[PDB]
């Protein structure tokens, strides 16, 4: 077994295959998904209060597609912090929101609006 | 876009899997070692081993096993890559035609799932009914073997047992059956099964075996007489056969883990075992005949057999001879005894094999200030630890110094009839003459004979009739036991000066102008037999000892003034055999005749540094095509001789090369001398059978060792090396070490074997125990293999361990460079350490220590206690750069012998790699990617220019040209991120772009600058890289016009070359992680290019289609120019 | 490049007919300037602190002096450099800063108390802290708090003397917090050297300027409270 220490997993992987041997894979992930830090805060300073419901990322991760309580999805740059272009999509709200991988489609679901 | 060039300098050395059998012949046992991608087909002689054909493939060989199916007199070989493409191999030989046939193949893999945890495991059924494969952790992929399979079909019968540790097959019981070692949630067991291939379903198993030892690692199945399954564990050994059971717990196997096994006897009577520490054991089975037909087990014996290298292959060959195969160093061949020695070892050491194995650091450094830089790679492991020195050319270093520049010829004169004892020499100027002696390395001048004490000589050989041939002005003569009167001075009937004479051991060949004479050496009689005449005057003559150890040569060599002559005569009779007149002003030093173990060639030493490849049959007179090879600007000399044996062949030219062999192949290998004109077979008292070299400089009586491209010299230390640095001012290296020790109950610690760490010239220990306030060092119970590191300063030339500085308890040595900091002119050693404990997370302790070597004494000047582990250090313009737990922390030297943190950085996951070139800093992250970081000297602080975002686990990085940045990966791959040019906005200028992808099928440890060839003052720059299999290659930069020239030649060769496996090279070099199957671009795989030299011209002519050539210009490609461009790359390597 | 190191040294009083308001609005620039270490290294090395300690004590510019002292020791380790000088450099620091906490400014106790929150790691800071009055000039802050005076707690109701008088004790307890974590490791040195006596200890002690307060109340300040049980 690879040892519980990480630097001793670093000396061992130099003279052994990929991770350090048997049981070296998760011992990376028990060090690297156990911490987080805030990057940036995104408001909805239009009515001076934020009313989003659903969120996702684009097919190339450059813009994050929020969804308000009014019925419109609003694009935002992940680097800038500025609205790009809203879209009057539904009437009720937004529950589910995902793109595809090829970058062609978009599925947006409403709460009670007559096309769902 | 970035286009670069990658070849193989060192072929891989560490071995992986060793299968014996009858692959080549039916009744001939052989050895089949795979190393990384090569498949080395040996054969077993009674004297040892012998290769047949080395074959490389496009994929990492990890699983291999021979098998003879029913229907084949010989066997077959099955090999699976690391990219899941399988193949079935078949050897075909037809005379000298030595071929590998892949009978069936097919990439078998799945879209989804975890691959594995313990690698890939594959075992063949003994009835040759199925083929085992553990591939995706829940599937058990079975290959139904049939001649119906021109491609491989696949089954996937689900394992309801997920986490399998080992799997094997059991022997002949009318059904193909399986064994496990499965980890239950509650306990662990050994289950069996039974597979119906006609029904794809597990049947009801014959064994249950509901609980076993807690650490069962391997399963050793015993054969058909007394069939069962031994279960080795960490601590004990069992036996199982469904009804009975036997169990032992021998006190031998108490301090090591069993790693390898083999079936020694064909009825399975004996078994050999290795360990993790070098031992070899033997399992003896007490065969018990209970009844007239009943075979059963009685006793289990474990006998200690002695110490070898760390085994991962284990093959008993025959007659007590076993090969030991190591990844970790020095795969060697051993012999078993019957009686014992002073330590109980039956193990007889034999000849070894050279392995680099795991390279952990490199530095390309020259020690003789030539254009050729030497290479010092840290190699080995726990007790195989050894620096290895890799150099181009041939190491002519055991040479005497005698001041005779530009001298024409030195020829022996003996007095002992039955030995070479008391050999005086002949000093031959042009117009002057002396007689030389040899006191080993030194000379004495005298006058001995009385014939040639007045006029010059040219050629005075050694007659096997205990005579000698003296040539003074115009006449030849025989020599008695040192006379002063002539024995038989045959005059010449022309009364002219001899233009070019020559001699042999049975004949005299003298050319005067155009008249070519011949003398038959009788006992004390010179008789004329044959005579022929040349159309021009004779430029030179050559006589080589071809046959019978007598001096009879069926061929002749003819050279003419201002006329290239390939005229070939039957020299005893001078019969015309081949007549070819090339023509031209270049004067040749005619022909060197030496058979290079396969064919007689002719080797013409042309004027002004030119070389031709001629091939002649010694009985017909038909020549092949010529081949222009450049050596220099002066006329060349081609000679053959005896170094000690094997008829060594040398090229005395402006580029002095060894012609004879290079991995048994005609590729030139240099020597460590600048320019060589002549050679002289002298007789030194301190140099056995050595030769002196008359040059444009001094005379070097030296011999030549084993000839290869890369001579490898081992400096063993018997402990794990970590890094390597270099001192210019001091003449010393530095190697960080790692030794295994156990904790004593009374004493502090104790070692295990006498390595070169304790055997040092001076010892010391660290002081100022500054981790004393932390109460973390609590007590441990037993001696459970702690690690102890120290600094080893190795001498420059004697390579003696000069000093050892043992660190504190459980303090690693992780980082080492050697540079100068600030305005202090001292050159330091800088070691950044970390404090480690198991059962602990990432550490938050450590210090950084700076050393010096004042008068051969190591001094601890200053230390800096740092809250974090130190991973990488590089010098940065007089300032110290470090990487301390995702915090790039640049330093600064003060006059107060301290350090001051000048700046910091905090946007990192975990920064492990640091490379600088000028004022850019390239940071290799743990999981994310290439990170380029700027340093503004005006601001004083770092600045994030850009950052890549695609999460690849880094392995090693290196700056190419401050625009293109090379990065490796854990997924055995290469890519370059190019800094983005279109700075249109601020978002698009903080994003790097991955430009070019490559699958270097090998782990990468090191990168460094510096080349391996001599500086003759093409391509630009050179980066060498360190690996884990001992496979050093080169990375360099191309020109974009040549990239379009080279890449189209890759696509031409990828329709002609049938690589073994039928593997597409575009598919094999494709960038393949677990989530990206993106095809490769950018780089050039020059190892596919340089095999064009091996392609025959009826298949080279089909490579040359309507292609392009740059010599702003535009020309259709031709065969004789495309073969030049490869040679423009082959001169690098 | 344009000498803003040398521009701002002229703008503070040097035996000169200056006002108060241009000087106090010059340090307000200079406190934004002292954030960078490459500036901050050269300020002390060219003698800016002794220049900054030229103010007579009744002055309206005392707030900017405390801001230039607070961002002096904010992130850079400049207080390591203040030691090796003529002897009365920190003796002018202890004289002026403790007077400024005694001056009872409306925000002079909001900054000059924060200066003692980190700089207690240096042992000579605590050494000059005890040759003077010490906590007699510290406890007199808490004992004069009108939010604590139960006999006069219904006297002041305006929110100026409430939010400022419920903040003043908050930074004072943190001034106490790193005071006792420091003196825990001080007496632990007077435990691990006087009691152990080479039994697991090394007698090397230069009295350096060095940060040895163990800096973690999650792990090791908790741990140092345990090993004092083995004392006398």
Curated annotation (Swiss-Prot), chain B:
Residues 709-1038 are annotated as: WD repeat beta-propeller C. There is a cross-link at residue 1114 (Glycyl lysine isopeptide (Lys-Gly) (interchain with G-Cter in SUMO2)). It is found in: Cytoplasm; Nucleus. GO terms for molecular function: cullin family protein binding; damaged DNA binding; DNA binding; protein-containing complex binding; protein-macromolecule adaptor activity; ubiquitin ligase complex scaffold activity; WD40-repeat domain binding. The modification N-acetylserine is found at residue 2. GO terms for biological process: apoptotic process; biological process involved in interaction with symbiont; cellular response to UV; DNA damage response; DNA repair; ectopic germ cell programmed cell death; epigenetic programming in the zygotic pronuclei; negative regulation of apoptotic process. Residues 392-708 are annotated as: WD repeat beta-propeller B. Residues 2-768 are annotated as: Interaction with CDT1. Pathway: Protein modification; protein ubiquitination. The keyword Repeat applies. Residues 13-356 are annotated as: WD repeat beta-propeller A. Phosphorylated by ABL1. It comes from the Eukaryota. GO terms for cellular component: chromosome, telomeric region; Cul4-RING E3 ubiquitin ligase complex; Cul4A-RING E3 ubiquitin ligase complex; Cul4B-RING E3 ubiquitin ligase complex; cytoplasm; extracellular exosome; extracellular space; nucleolus. The keyword Oxidoreductase does not apply. InterPro entries: Beta-prop_RSE1/DDB1/CPSF1_1st, Cleavage/polyA-sp_fac_asu_C, RSE1/DDB1/CFT1/CPSF1, WD40/YVTN_repeat-like_dom_sf, WD40_repeat_dom_sf. Coiled coil: none annotated. Keywords: Acetylation, Biological rhythms, Cytoplasm, Disease variant, DNA damage, DNA repair, DNA-binding, Host-virus interaction, Intellectual disability, Isopeptide bond, Nucleus, Phosphoprotein, Repeat, Ubl conjugation, Ubl conjugation pathway. The modification Phosphothreonine is found at residue 1118. Residues 771-1133 are annotated as: Interaction with CDT1 and CUL4A. It holds the Pfam family Beta-prop_RSE1_2nd. It is linked to White-Kernohan syndrome: An autosomal dominant disorder characterized by global developmental delay, variably impaired intellectual development, hypotonia, and characteristic facial features. Some patients may have genitourinary and skeletal abnormalities. Protein, which is both involved in DNA repair and protein ubiquitination, as part of the UV-DDB complex and DCX (DDB1-CUL4-X-box) complexes, respectively. Core component of the UV-DDB complex (UV-damaged DNA-binding protein complex), a complex that recognizes UV-induced DNA damage and recruit proteins of the nucleotide excision repair pathway (the NER pathway) to initiate DNA repair. The UV-DDB complex preferentially binds to cyclobutane pyrimidine dimers (CPD), 6-4 photoproducts (6-4 PP), apurinic sites and short mismatches. The core of the protein consists of three WD40 beta-propeller domains. This is DNA damage-binding protein 1.
UniProtKB/Swiss-Prot annotation, chain C:
It is found in: Cytoplasm; Nucleus; Cytoplasm, Cytoskeleton, Microtubule organizing center, Centrosome. It comes from the Eukaryota. Changing residue 30 to F: Does not affect serine/threonine-protein kinase kinase activity. Induction: Up-regulated in a number of cancer cell lines (at protein level). Ubiquitously expressed. Belongs to the VPRBP/DCAF1 family. Acts both as a substrate recognition component of E3 ubiquitin-protein ligase complexes and as an atypical serine/threonine-protein kinase, playing key roles in various processes such as cell cycle, telomerase regulation and histone modification. Probable substrate-specific adapter of a DCX (DDB1-CUL4-X-box) E3 ubiquitin-protein ligase complex, named CUL4A-RBX1-DDB1-DCAF1/VPRBP complex, which mediates ubiquitination and proteasome-dependent degradation of proteins such as NF2. The protein kinase-like region mediates the threonine-protein kinase activity. The DWD boxes are required for interaction with DDB1. Component of the DCX (DDB1-CUL4-X-box) E3 ubiquitin-protein ligase complex, named CUL4A-RBX1-DDB1-DCAF1/VPRBP complex. Interacts with DDB1; the interaction is direct. Also forms a ternary complex with DDA1 and DDB1. Interacts with NF2 (via FERM domain). Component of the EDVP complex, a E3 ligase complex containing DYRK2, EDD/UBR5, DDB1 and DCAF1. Interacts with DYRK2; the interaction is direct. Interacts with RAG1; the interaction is direct. Interacts with LLGL1 and LLGL2. Interacts with histone H3. (Microbial infection) Interacts with HIV-1 virus Vpr protein; the interaction is direct. This is DDB1- and CUL4-associated factor 1. The gene is DCAF1. The chain holds residues 349 to 580 of 1507 of the full protein.
């Amino acid at each position: 077994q690879a040892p519980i220490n990480f630097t001793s997993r670093l000396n061992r992987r130099a003279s052994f295959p990929k991770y350090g041997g048997v049981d070296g894979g998760c011992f990376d992930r028990h060090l690297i998904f156990s911490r987080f830090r805030p990057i940036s805060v995104f408001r909805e300073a239009n009515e001076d209060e934020s009313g989003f419901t659903c969120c996702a990322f684009s097919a190339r991760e450059r813009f994050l597609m929020l969804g308000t309580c009014t019925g419109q999805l609003k694009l935002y740059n992940v680097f800038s912090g500025q609205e790009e272009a809203s879209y009057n999509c539904h009437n009720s709200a937004i529950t589910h929101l995902e793109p595809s991988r090829d970058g062609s489609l978009l599925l947006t679901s409403a709460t009670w609006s007559q096309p769902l | 876009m970035s286009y670069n060039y990658v070849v193989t300098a060192q072929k891989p050395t560490a071995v992986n899997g060793c299968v014996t059998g009858h692959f080549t012949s039916a009744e001939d046992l052989n050895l089949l070692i795979a190393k990384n991608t090569r498949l080395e087909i040996y054969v077993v002689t009674a004297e040892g081993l012998r290769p047949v054909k080395e074959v490389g493939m496009y994929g990492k060989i990890a699983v291999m096993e021979l098998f003879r199916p029913k229907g084949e007199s010989k066997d077959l070989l099955f090999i699976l890559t690391a990219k899941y493409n399988a193949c079935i191999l078949e050897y075909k030989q037809s005379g000298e035609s030595i071929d590998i046939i892949t009978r069936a193949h097919g990439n078998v893999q799945d879209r989804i799932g975890r691959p594995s945890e313990t690698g890939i495991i594959g075992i063949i059924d003994p009835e040759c009914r199925m083929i085992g494969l553990r591939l995706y952790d829940g599937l058990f992929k079975v290959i139904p073997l049939d001649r119906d399979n021109k491609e491989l079909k696949a089954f996937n019968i689900r394992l309801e047992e997920l986490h399998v540790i080992d799997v094997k097959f059991l022997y002949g019981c009318q059904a193909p059956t399986i064994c496990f070692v499965y980890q239950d949630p509650q306990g662990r067991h050994v289950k069996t099964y039974e597979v119906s291939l006609r029904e794809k379903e597990f049947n009801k198993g014959p064994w249950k075996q509901e609980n076993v030892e807690a650490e069962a690692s391997m399963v050793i199945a015993v054969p058909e007489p007394f069939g069962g399954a031994i279960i080795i564990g960490q601590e004990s050994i069992t036996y199982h056969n469904g009804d009975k059971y036997l169990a032992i717990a021998p006190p031998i196997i108490k301090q090591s883990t069993i790693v390898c096994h083999n079936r020694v006897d064909p009825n399975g009577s004996r078994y050999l075992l290795g360990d993790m520490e070098g031992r070899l054991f033997m399992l003896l089975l007490e065969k018990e005949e209970q009844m007239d037909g009943t075979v059963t087990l009685k006793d289990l014996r474990v006998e200690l057999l002695g110490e070898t290298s760390i085994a991962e292959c284990l093959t008993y060959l025959d007659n007590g001879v076993v090969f030991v195969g190591s990844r970790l160093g020095d795969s060697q061949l051993v012999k078993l005894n019957v009686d014992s020695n002073e330590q109980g070892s039956y193990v007889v050491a034999m000849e070894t094999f050279t392995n680099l194995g795991p390279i952990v650091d490199m530095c390309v450094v020259d020690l003789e200030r030539q254009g050729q830089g030497q290479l010092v790679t840290c190699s080995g492991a726990f007790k195989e630890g050894s620096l290895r020195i890799i150099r181009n050319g041939i190491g002519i270093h055991e040479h005497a110094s005698i001041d005779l520049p530009g001298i024409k010829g030195l020829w022996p004169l003996r007095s002992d009839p039955n030995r070479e004892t008391d050999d005086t020499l002949v000093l031959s100027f042009v117009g002057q003459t002396r007689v030389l002696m040899l006191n080993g390395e030194e000379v004495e001048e005298t006058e001995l004979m009385g014939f040639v004490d007045d006029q010059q000589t040219f050629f005075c050989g050694n007659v096997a009739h205990q005579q000698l041939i003296q040539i003074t002005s115009a006449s030849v003569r025989l020599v008695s036991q040192e006379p002063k009167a002539l024995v038989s001075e045959w005059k010449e009937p022309q009364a002219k000066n001899i233009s070019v004479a020559s001699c042999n051991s049975s004949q005299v060949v003298v050319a005067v102008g155009r008249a070519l004479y011949y003398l038959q050496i009788h006992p004390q009689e010179l008789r004329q037999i044959s005579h022929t005449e040349m159309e021009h005057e004779v430029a030179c003559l050559d006589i080589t000892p071809l046959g019978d150890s007598n001096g009879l040569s069926p061929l002749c060599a003819i050279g003419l003034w201002t006329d290239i002559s390939a005229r070939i005569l039957k020299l005893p009779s001078f019969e015309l055999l081949h007549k070819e007149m090339l023509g031209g002003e270049i004067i040749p030093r005619s022909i060197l005749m030496t058979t290079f173990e396969s064919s007689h060639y002719l080797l013409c030493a042309l004027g002004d540094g030119a070389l031709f490849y001629f091939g002649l049959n010694i009985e017909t007179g038909l020549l092949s095509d010529r081949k222009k090879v450049t050596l220099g600007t002066q006329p060349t000399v081609l000679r053959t001789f005896r170094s000690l044996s094997t008829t060594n062949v040398f090229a005395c030219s402006d580029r002095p090369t060894v012609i004879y062999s290079s991995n048994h192949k005609l590729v030139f290998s240099n020597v460590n001398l600048k320019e060589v004109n002549y050679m002289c077979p002298l007789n030194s008292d301190g140099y056995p059978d050595s030769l002196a070299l008359a040059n444009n400089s001094t005379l070097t009586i030296g011999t030549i060792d084993e000839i290869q491209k890369l001579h490898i010299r081992t400096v063993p230390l018997y402990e794990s090396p970590r890094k390597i640095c270099y001192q210019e001012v001091s003449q010393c290296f530095g190697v960080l070490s790692s030794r295994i020790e156990v904790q004593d109950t009374s004493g502090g610690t104790t070692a295990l074997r006498p390595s070169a760490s304790t055997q040092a010239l001076s010892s010391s220990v660290s002081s100022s125990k500054l981790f004393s306030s932390s109460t973390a060092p609590h007590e441990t119970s037993f001696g459970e293999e702690v690690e102890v590191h120290n600094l080893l300063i190795i001498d420059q030339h004697t390579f003696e361990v000069l000093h050892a500085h043992q660190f504190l308890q459980n303090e690693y040595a992780l980082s080492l460079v050697s540079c100068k900091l600030g305005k202090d002119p001292n050159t330091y050693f800088i070691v950044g350490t970390a404090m480690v404990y198991p059962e602990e997370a990432e550490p938050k302790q450590g210090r950084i220590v700076v050393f010096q070597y004042s008068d051969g004494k190591l001094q601890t000047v200053a230390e800096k206690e740092v809250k974090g582990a130190v991973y990488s250090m590089v010098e940065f313009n007089g300032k110290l750069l470090a990487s301390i737990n995702s915090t790039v922390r640049l330093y600064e030297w003060t006059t107060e012998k301290e350090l001051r943190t000048e700046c910091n950085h905090y946007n990192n996951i975990m920064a492990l790699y640091l490379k600088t070139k000028g004022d850019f800093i390239l940071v290799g992250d743990l999981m994310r990617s290439v990170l380029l970081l700027a340093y503004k000297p005006m601001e004083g602080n770092f600045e994030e220019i850009a950052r890549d975002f695609n999460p690849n686990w880094m392995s090693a990085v290196e700056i190419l040209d401050d625009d293109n940045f090379l990065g490796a990966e854990n997924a055995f791959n290469l890519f370059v991120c190019q800094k983005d040019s279109a700075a249109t906005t601020d978002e698009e200028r903080q994003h790097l772009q991955e430009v070019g992808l490559f699958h270097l099928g090998e782990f990468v440890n090191v990168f460094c600058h510096g080349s391996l060839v001599m500086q003759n003052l093409p391509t630009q720059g050179s980066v060498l890289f360190g690996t884990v299999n001992g496979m050093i290659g080169l990375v360099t930069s191309l020109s974009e016009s040549w990239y379009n020239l080279l890449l189209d030649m890759q696509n031409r060769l990828n329709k002609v070359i049938k690589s073994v496996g039928k593997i597409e090279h575009s598919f094999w070099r494709s960038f393949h992680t677990e989530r990206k199957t993106e095809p490769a671009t950018g780089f050039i795989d020059g190892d596919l290019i340089e095999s064009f030299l091996d392609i025959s011209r009826p298949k080279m002519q089909e490579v040359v289609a309507n292609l392009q050539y740059d010599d702003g210009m535009k020309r259709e490609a031709t065969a004789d120019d495309l073969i030049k461009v490869v040679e423009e790359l082959t001169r690098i390597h | 490049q344009l000498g803003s190191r040398e521009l701002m040294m002229f703008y503070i009083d040097l035996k000169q007919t200056n006002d108060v308001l241009l000087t106090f609005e010059a340090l307000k620039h200079l406190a934004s300037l002292l954030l960078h270490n490459k500036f901050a290294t050269e300020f002390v090395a060219h003698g800016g602190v002794q220049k900054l300690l030229e103010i007579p004590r009744p002055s309206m510019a005392a707030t900017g002096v405390s801001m230039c002292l607070y961002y002096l020791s904010y992130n850079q380790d400049a207080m390591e450099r203040v030691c090796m000088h003529p002897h009365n450099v920190l003796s002018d620091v202890v004289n002026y800063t403790l007077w400024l906490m005694e001056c009872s400014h409306a925000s002079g106790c909001c900054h000059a108390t924060m200066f003692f929150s980190i700089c207690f790691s240096f042992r000579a800071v605590l050494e000059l802290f005890d040759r003077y009055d010490g906590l007699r000039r510290l406890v007199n802050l808490i004992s004069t708090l009108e939010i604590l005076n139960l006999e006069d707690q219904g006297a002041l109701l305006s929110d100026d003397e409430i939010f400022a008088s419920r903040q003043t004790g908050k930074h004072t307890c943190m001034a106490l917090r790193k005071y006792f974590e420091a003196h825990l490791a001080i007496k632990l040195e007077q435990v691990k050297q006087s009691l152990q006596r080479t039994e697991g200890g090394i007698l090397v002690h230069p009295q350096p300027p060095y940060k040895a307060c163990s800096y973690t109340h999650e792990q090791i300040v908790e741990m140092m409270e345990f090993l004092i049980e083995y004392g006398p």
